[PDB]
Amino acid sequence: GDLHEILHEAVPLDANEREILELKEDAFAQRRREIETRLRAANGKLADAIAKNPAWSPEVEAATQEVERAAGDLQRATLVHVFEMRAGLKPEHRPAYDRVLIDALRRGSQ
Amino acid sequence: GDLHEILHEAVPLDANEREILELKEDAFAQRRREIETRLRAANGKLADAIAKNPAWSPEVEAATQEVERAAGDLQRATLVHVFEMRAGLKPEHRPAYDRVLIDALRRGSQ
Ligand code: NI
Ligand code: NI
């Protein structure tokens, strides 16, 4: 279900590809961490709101929206980076990458 | 991570609660199935779009938005039903329910 991990594990970068993509990989790792931090905080606000008053409320509406926004940010950032990686591949490596990517997407990997 | 399942498993309904909530449980089961069907179809459209052209595109934008919409529908429907169940509990059972619910939410269960 971890799309990014599935790709790095099944179709790992070659020596030159790894060197070329290192900067983008690192930038994505930091971006993912930041979004995940927001997501955990949103989860906490949702739990907090429900602990206070276990019903839909402005606090629950806001927290649920924050959760969904962070989740969407994560989904999009990951897919953009998946396309980044594809751009950094030797053209001849792209078909295997696509096979893994398409199959994983069909299963709902994100 | 399955909030609904976590609750039914850890704080199962008593005999009378189960009888009273049966209709709502069934309605939710059907609603969940319908949303999941939409989600699987959205995942398929996203895979299809990327199989055709592995880049961001109107098709990828539309599919990703459909995925996020279905996921949001699922999150909200589940939480509304979680509150439905709470309303059907004997008042004295609500605190244990809340303990499980709050702890699970903090971990990002949906
Ligand atoms: Ni990567
Ligand atoms: Ni239920």
Swiss-Prot record, chains A, B:
Cell compartment(s), UniProt: Periplasm
Signals that turn on the gene: By nickel and cobalt.
Coiled-coil segments on the chain, per record: 16-79
Cellular component terms (Gene Ontology): periplasmic space
Highest taxon listed in the record's lineage: Bacteria
Residue ranges, Periplasmic side: 1-110
UniProt entry keywords in alphabetical sequence: Cobalt, Coiled coil, Nickel, Periplasm, Plasmid, Signal
Family the entry assigns: To A.xylosoxydans NccX.
Protein role: CnrH alone is able to activate cnr expression, while both CnrY and CrnR (CnrX) are needed for nickel induction of CnrH. Has been suggested to bind nickel.
Record-given protein name: Nickel and cobalt resistance protein CnrR
